[PDB]
Design an enzyme around this catalytic site. Sequence first.
Site, PDB file in Angstrom:
ATOM      1  N   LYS A 154      -0.083   4.119  -0.149  1.00  0.00           N
ATOM      2  CA  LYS A 154      -0.846   5.222   0.467  1.00  0.00           C
ATOM      3  C   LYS A 154      -0.758   6.468  -0.422  1.00  0.00           C
ATOM      4  O   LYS A 154      -0.794   6.335  -1.649  1.00  0.00           O
ATOM      5  CB  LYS A 154      -0.396   5.483   1.906  1.00  0.00           C
ATOM      6  CG  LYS A 154      -0.426   4.214   2.776  1.00  0.00           C
ATOM      7  CD  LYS A 154      -0.107   4.536   4.236  1.00  0.00           C
ATOM      8  CE  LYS A 154      -0.218   3.279   5.120  1.00  0.00           C
ATOM      9  NZ  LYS A 154      -0.101   3.608   6.587  1.00  0.00           N
ATOM     10  N   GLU A 162      -7.139   4.572   7.736  1.00  0.00           N
ATOM     11  CA  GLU A 162      -6.980   5.997   7.448  1.00  0.00           C
ATOM     12  C   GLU A 162      -8.265   6.570   6.849  1.00  0.00           C
ATOM     13  O   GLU A 162      -8.621   7.717   7.111  1.00  0.00           O
ATOM     14  CB  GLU A 162      -5.757   6.229   6.530  1.00  0.00           C
ATOM     15  CG  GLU A 162      -4.456   6.001   7.288  1.00  0.00           C
ATOM     16  CD  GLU A 162      -3.308   5.553   6.412  1.00  0.00           C
ATOM     17  OE1 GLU A 162      -3.428   5.605   5.165  1.00  0.00           O
ATOM     18  OE2 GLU A 162      -2.293   5.127   6.984  1.00  0.00           O
ATOM     19  N   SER A 209       2.672  -2.731  11.397  1.00  0.00           N
ATOM     20  CA  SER A 209       4.009  -2.416  10.898  1.00  0.00           C
ATOM     21  C   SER A 209       4.750  -3.658  10.440  1.00  0.00           C
ATOM     22  O   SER A 209       5.033  -4.546  11.239  1.00  0.00           O
ATOM     23  CB  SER A 209       4.840  -1.687  11.951  1.00  0.00           C
ATOM     24  OG  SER A 209       6.102  -1.323  11.401  1.00  0.00           O
ATOM     25  N   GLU A 245      -5.701  -4.527  10.881  1.00  0.00           N
ATOM     26  CA  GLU A 245      -4.847  -3.401  11.250  1.00  0.00           C
ATOM     27  C   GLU A 245      -4.927  -3.167  12.746  1.00  0.00           C
ATOM     28  O   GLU A 245      -5.999  -2.892  13.263  1.00  0.00           O
ATOM     29  CB  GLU A 245      -5.322  -2.124  10.564  1.00  0.00           C
ATOM     30  CG  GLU A 245      -5.266  -2.137   9.047  1.00  0.00           C
ATOM     31  CD  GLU A 245      -5.708  -0.790   8.508  1.00  0.00           C
ATOM     32  OE1 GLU A 245      -4.855   0.133   8.459  1.00  0.00           O
ATOM     33  OE2 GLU A 245      -6.917  -0.638   8.230  1.00  0.00           O
ATOM     34  N   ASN A 302       0.836  -1.197   0.000  1.00  0.00           N
ATOM     35  CA  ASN A 302       0.000   0.000   0.000  1.00  0.00           C
ATOM     36  C   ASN A 302       0.870   1.244   0.000  1.00  0.00           C
ATOM     37  O   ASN A 302       1.375   1.653   1.047  1.00  0.00           O
ATOM     38  CB  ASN A 302      -0.910  -0.009   1.241  1.00  0.00           C
ATOM     39  CG  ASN A 302      -1.855   1.173   1.282  1.00  0.00           C
ATOM     40  OD1 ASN A 302      -1.997   1.910   0.298  1.00  0.00           O
ATOM     41  ND2 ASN A 302      -2.529   1.353   2.423  1.00  0.00           N
ATOM     42  N   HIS A 361      -9.640   0.897   4.741  1.00  0.00           N
ATOM     43  CA  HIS A 361      -8.381   1.196   5.429  1.00  0.00           C
ATOM     44  C   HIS A 361      -8.637   2.126   6.613  1.00  0.00           C
ATOM     45  O   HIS A 361      -9.484   3.018   6.524  1.00  0.00           O
ATOM     46  CB  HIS A 361      -7.362   1.835   4.485  1.00  0.00           C
ATOM     47  CG  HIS A 361      -5.969   1.824   5.030  1.00  0.00           C
ATOM     48  ND1 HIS A 361      -5.501   2.771   5.916  1.00  0.00           N
ATOM     49  CD2 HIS A 361      -4.949   0.952   4.838  1.00  0.00           C
ATOM     50  CE1 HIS A 361      -4.252   2.487   6.242  1.00  0.00           C
ATOM     51  NE2 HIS A 361      -3.890   1.393   5.595  1.00  0.00           N
ATOM     52  N   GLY A 418       0.396   5.184  16.168  1.00  0.00           N
ATOM     53  CA  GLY A 418       0.423   6.524  16.731  1.00  0.00           C
ATOM     54  C   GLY A 418      -0.115   6.634  18.145  1.00  0.00           C
ATOM     55  O   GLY A 418      -0.666   7.668  18.539  1.00  0.00           O
TER      56      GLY A 418
END
Lengths: 251, 251
Positions: free
Chosen positions: B10, B95, B211, B165, B8, B93, B171
């Site tokens: 992104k 995001e 990750s 995910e 991906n 996703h 974060g």
Amino acid sequence: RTFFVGGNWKANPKTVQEAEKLVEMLNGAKVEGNVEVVVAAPFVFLPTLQQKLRKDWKVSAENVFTKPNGAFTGEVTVPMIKSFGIEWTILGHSERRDILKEDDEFLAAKAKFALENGMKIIYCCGEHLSEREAGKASEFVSAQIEKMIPAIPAGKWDDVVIAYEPIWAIGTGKVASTQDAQEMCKVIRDILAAKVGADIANKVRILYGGSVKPNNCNELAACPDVDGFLVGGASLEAGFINIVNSNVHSK
Amino acid sequence: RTFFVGGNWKANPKTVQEAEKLVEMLNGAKVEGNVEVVVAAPFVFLPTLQQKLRKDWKVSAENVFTKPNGAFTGEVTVPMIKSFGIEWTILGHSERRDILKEDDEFLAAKAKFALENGMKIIYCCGEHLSEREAGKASEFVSAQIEKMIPAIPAGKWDDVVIAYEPIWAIGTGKVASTQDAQEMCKVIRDILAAKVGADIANKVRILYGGSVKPNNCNELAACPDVDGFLVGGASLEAGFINIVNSNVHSK
Ligand code: NA
Ligand code: NA
């Protein structure tokens, strides 16, 4: 001010093969008068438009994100567009504000980032049915424009075009008159004059972004504060050139 | 099940020239073992990827809308993607769910439309920090998967890949272990078995989409319920091939 006509293909056509056929049609169109023409298309068709579209017209994206790149899956950014030589984007279209829930803060940040990075923008505004019926259209539109103003970097007003969308006349069962179009474009010009001065108000093109077709473009173009159009469905049709050519009726 | 690795990109890279350089790098990569590789990139780079990327791998969009075409300024649709010969899209996703506010209803409608129109999908799920800390990760993920299930048309499970995910580890100041990855992929497989049966649960690839880098891909690949990866930043680097090749450690 030079008359300005943007064709917003929206999420159309379905295929790159159709997009290419449309470009071939546009490339043979005979433009009369003096007019700045921009064609906005879906992201995946932008490369072929940039390569194939007549070079006296410009290609536009239909949206961009707020950042140069990064962890924003699905988003397209200004640098990506510019890497193809594309100079324009639409921002704040009613469909994105309403269906994709883009708010004024998000849109201001887009306008600032885009302009800082050398883009030109077509920034859209417009009131909904409630505010139209309440006689509060100018107040609503002013609030939108007042959010946009601080986003425009000094010296970047040459690169801003504003489109008024009568959202109150989109899928509501009400229709806009030519007079309605003139009144709201004048409203916007007056807000600019009051807030950032006559020089800016006098150079910024303000477009009508309601229903524009060959049967009403000439009358609309003649309105003194209407500087052009952000065209919807007709941008996909041979009638687009009639609309481009309505500039000859604008003094 | 064939090991599956999606890269991906992104919202990267910034330019089409960089995208082309990345494709040149990927095209020379020596793949070991048996693995299905898909590369997802920004819409404006999809045509050049489709043209230039090694044909033993497949190009993927990073998102699509719910309709074939229409009044959805800024949106790209399934028919547009397919017109280039592109077969895949990512959906849901983190995001997009979080930054662009895509909800499960919107995502289910995308999955149904995409599959009905011959696309293959990488459908993403995963829980946030609160639910992880509360020990309610499986409940949260199950609710997401249970929304996805009714969207999958009969006979279309061959065209579905699910990515987990660990949003609780993005974060937040917390990190995921290899064991965490295994546990959640198993959670998803068990939800599928309970809800749609063992045959489907046994064929659906479930990816780890946290990750993934060259320093942890082999250990992750060895986990029995981890069938591959949806790779973030490393997909832009020479390390991507190490991750593709981690398939040899998956039995
Ligand atoms: Na005029
Ligand atoms: Na494995």
